[PDB]
Design a binder for this molecule. Structure first.
Ligand SMILES: CN1[C@@H]2CC[C@H]1C[C@@H](OC(=O)[C@H](CO)c1ccccc1)C2
Ligand SMILES: [O]
Ligand SMILES: [Sr+2]
Ligand SMILES: [Sr+2]
Ligand SMILES: [V+3]
Length: 326
């Protein structure tokens, strides 16, 4: 493997990470109060859970995975059309909503063993969709339907979260969820998995993420122990973001997770990252604060947070360290 992709010794994954048997799998077709209670407990104790019987069509999930895999099978000459000035874009502000191919890593500088297609999905209009990939031919039709369905499911989950916290329904149905970035991640086979990472350990910086996977590689950090997240092809993995950790005043955990490489087979995952506009002010929900529950963060600019989150990887929560109080 090229030295560009060699992770620092301490960040390298061990070869036998055990299955996370305690990862909650929440059936959304249970009684309403049972769903609210199970989601609440998962958010409080884990910050990562799976949802099943979630009302998003299984056929649409399969068609979206198909067209995402078809995109990454396109030849070089087509993929160049999504590389600004001949190279992949970087996860840095301003983060534009038009489709680009992205490179990612840490600055002992190294790169993640990953190609990422990213674009905005909300609101859907002619201008946004016309900035999506031209190939495959059905990408725009399928991903337009997928993005609406994934948003619908995310807003259902956020309203379950509202009921669990004692916030009014629709608390997050505003500026706090106005950005919907869809990241299609391609992990080609890696000749030295012991030295590389598909994706470094991170919180998602946004509010909430729904992740679709059909192959192993996703791992979560629990009380410095890593566990493997079982791939369920018809489920969504829910990762609570650093923004939700702040707004709930740490009553909810954020999901710290990474992706390991595979020597023999490729892997495609689809992450829908919903969260605030860059103009937003983030603070602990006033409605939940008291003398017994004082705010642990001061108000901050999401744009200012974003710049630190995307550059400083000295700690998982480096993004919010400057805003910590009490
Ligand atoms: C694995 N990496 C992590 C998470 C996804 C991917 C790319 C990057 O995250 C983002 O670019 C998101 C886009 O919403 C972001 C940007 C600024 C603020 C909050 C969130 C870091
Ligand atoms: O992510
Ligand atoms: Sr190029
Ligand atoms: Sr175009
Ligand atoms: V993530």
């Amino acid at each position: 493997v090229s030295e560009s992709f060699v992770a620092p010794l301490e960040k390298r994954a061990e070869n036998d990470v055990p299955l996370g048997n305690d990862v909650p799998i929440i059936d959304l077709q249970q009684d309403h109060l049972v769903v609210v209670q199970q989601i609440t407990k998962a958010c409080q104790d884990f910050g990562l859970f799976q949802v099943i019987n979630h009302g998003l069509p299984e056929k649409l999930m399969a068609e979206t995975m198909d067209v995402c895999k078809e995109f990454f099978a396109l030849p070089a000459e087509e993929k160049e059309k999504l590389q600004p000035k001949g190279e992949p874009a970087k996860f840095e502000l301003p983060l534009e909503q038009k489709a680009k191919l992205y490179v990612e890593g840490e600055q002992e500088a190294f790169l993640y063993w990953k190609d990422t297609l990213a674009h905005g999905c909300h609101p859907l209009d002619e201008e946004l969709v016309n900035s999506w990939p031209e190939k495959p031919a059905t990408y725009r039709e399928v991903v337009a339907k997928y993005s609406v369905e994934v948003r619908k499911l995310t807003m259902r989950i956020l309203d379950y979260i509202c009921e669990g916290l004692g916030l009014k329904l629709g608390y997050f149905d505003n500026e706090l969820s106005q950005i919907q970035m869809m990241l299609t991640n391609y992990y080609p086979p890696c000749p030295d998995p012991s030295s590389t990472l598909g994706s470094g350990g991170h919180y998602d910086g946004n509010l909430i993420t729904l992740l679709q996977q059909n192959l192993p590689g996703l791992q979560q950090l629990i009380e410095a122990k890593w566990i493997a997240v079982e791939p369920i092809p018809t489920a969504f993995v829910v990762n609570l973001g650093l923004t939700l950790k702040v707004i709930t005043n740490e009553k909810f955990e954020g999901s710290i997770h990474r992706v390991v490489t595979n020597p023999t087979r490729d892997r495609v995952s689809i992450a829908t990252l919903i969260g605030p506009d860059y103009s937003c002010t983030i603070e602990p929900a006033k409605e939940l604060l008291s003398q017994d529950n004082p705010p642990l963060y001061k108000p901050y600019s999401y744009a200012e947070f974003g710049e630190i989150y995307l550059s400083d990887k000295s700690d998982y929560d480096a993004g919010v360290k400057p805003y910590k109080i009490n």
